Design an enzyme around this catalytic site. Sequence first.
Site, PDB file in Angstrom:
ATOM      1  N   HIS A  40     -39.780 -45.457  11.254  1.00 49.22           N
ATOM      2  CA  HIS A  40     -39.749 -45.147  12.694  1.00 49.22           C
ATOM      3  C   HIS A  40     -41.092 -45.631  13.205  1.00 49.22           C
ATOM      4  O   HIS A  40     -42.059 -45.829  12.450  1.00 49.22           O
ATOM      5  CB  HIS A  40     -39.547 -43.659  13.043  1.00 49.22           C
ATOM      6  CG  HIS A  40     -40.600 -42.687  12.603  1.00 49.22           C
ATOM      7  ND1 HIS A  40     -41.855 -42.530  13.142  1.00 49.22           N
ATOM      8  CD2 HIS A  40     -40.565 -41.775  11.587  1.00 49.22           C
ATOM      9  CE1 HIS A  40     -42.500 -41.610  12.479  1.00 49.22           C
ATOM     10  NE2 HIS A  40     -41.739 -41.110  11.537  1.00 49.22           N
ATOM     11  N   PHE A  99     -53.627 -38.707  10.085  1.00 47.97           N
ATOM     12  CA  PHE A  99     -53.660 -39.586   8.896  1.00 47.97           C
ATOM     13  C   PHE A  99     -55.075 -40.147   8.715  1.00 47.97           C
ATOM     14  O   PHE A  99     -55.728 -40.234   9.725  1.00 47.97           O
ATOM     15  CB  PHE A  99     -52.679 -40.716   9.060  1.00 47.97           C
ATOM     16  CG  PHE A  99     -51.207 -40.412   9.000  1.00 47.97           C
ATOM     17  CD1 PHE A  99     -50.554 -40.371   7.748  1.00 47.97           C
ATOM     18  CD2 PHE A  99     -50.499 -40.295  10.193  1.00 47.97           C
ATOM     19  CE1 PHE A  99     -49.170 -40.167   7.758  1.00 47.97           C
ATOM     20  CE2 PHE A  99     -49.114 -40.122  10.186  1.00 47.97           C
ATOM     21  CZ  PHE A  99     -48.462 -40.068   8.948  1.00 47.97           C
TER      22      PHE A  99
HETATM   23  N1  LIG Z   1     -50.431 -38.344  13.432  1.00 48.98           N
HETATM   24  C1  LIG Z   1     -49.549 -39.269  13.854  1.00 48.98           C
HETATM   25  N2  LIG Z   1     -48.286 -38.938  14.038  1.00 48.98           N
HETATM   26  C2  LIG Z   1     -47.542 -39.987  14.480  1.00 48.98           C
HETATM   27  C3  LIG Z   1     -47.955 -41.250  14.781  1.00 48.98           C
HETATM   28  N3  LIG Z   1     -46.844 -42.003  15.154  1.00 48.98           N
HETATM   29  C4  LIG Z   1     -45.828 -41.192  15.093  1.00 48.98           C
HETATM   30  N4  LIG Z   1     -46.178 -39.959  14.687  1.00 48.98           N
HETATM   31  C5  LIG Z   1     -45.363 -38.788  14.494  1.00 48.98           C
HETATM   32  O1  LIG Z   1     -45.643 -37.828  15.473  1.00 48.98           O
HETATM   33  C6  LIG Z   1     -45.775 -36.539  14.698  1.00 48.98           C
HETATM   34  C7  LIG Z   1     -47.238 -36.218  14.524  1.00 48.98           C
HETATM   35  O2  LIG Z   1     -47.721 -36.225  13.188  1.00 48.98           O
HETATM   36  C8  LIG Z   1     -44.899 -36.674  13.427  1.00 48.98           C
HETATM   37  O3  LIG Z   1     -43.525 -36.444  13.693  1.00 48.98           O
HETATM   38  C9  LIG Z   1     -45.246 -38.127  13.134  1.00 48.98           C
HETATM   39  O4  LIG Z   1     -44.411 -38.829  12.260  1.00 48.98           O
HETATM   40  P1  LIG Z   1     -44.348 -38.568  10.731  1.00 48.98           P
HETATM   41  O5  LIG Z   1     -44.560 -37.081  10.471  1.00 48.98           O
HETATM   42  O6  LIG Z   1     -43.025 -39.142  10.323  1.00 48.98           O
HETATM   43  O7  LIG Z   1     -45.418 -39.356   9.948  1.00 48.98           O
HETATM   44  C10 LIG Z   1     -49.330 -41.571  14.604  1.00 48.98           C
HETATM   45  O8  LIG Z   1     -49.925 -42.656  14.803  1.00 48.98           O
HETATM   46  N5  LIG Z   1     -50.068 -40.520  14.121  1.00 48.98           N
END
Ligand SMILES: Nc1nc2c(ncn2[C@@H]2O[C@H](CO)[C@@H](O)[C@H]2OP(=O)(O)O)c(=O)[nH]1
Length: 106
Positions: A40, A99
């Site tokens: 995604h 992250f």
């Molecule tokens: N922290 C973080 N979350 C993201 C980003 N892009 C999408 N998300 C999503 O927005 C939420 C914040 O963590 C989660 O649902 C996360 O996806 P994932 O958990 O699948 O990695 C990004 O750049 N950073």
Amino acid sequence: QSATTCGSTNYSASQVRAAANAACQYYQNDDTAGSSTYPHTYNNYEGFDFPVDGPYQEFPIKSGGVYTGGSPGADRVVINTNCEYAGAITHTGASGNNFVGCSGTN
Ligand SMILES: Nc1nc2c(ncn2[C@@H]2O[C@H](CO)[C@@H](O)[C@H]2OP(=O)(O)O)c(=O)[nH]1
């Protein structure tokens, strides 16, 4: 993609490619793995300086094979919509839903 260390986990270059490869495949077929939502869009809220331009897609990477659904774990591979490898990121050593880069990603 090259070898990388996310937190304490060491992924070989082949492991990163395979994950990167899978993400591309699914992105291309407008598919997701199992009952998950991966790959995604990866927004890059953290401001990583990826070597390729976006938009981006995130996909889990893990030991023991290509992610198929369920718990994604801490690690992820990031590719752009051109299926170009951007990098590897991890929740390990980060806070909340943030992250941090795996070795070589900053
Ligand atoms: N922290 C973080 N979350 C993201 C980003 N892009 C999408 N998300 C999503 O927005 C939420 C914040 O963590 C989660 O649902 C996360 O996806 P994932 O958990 O699948 O990695 C990004 O750049 N950073």
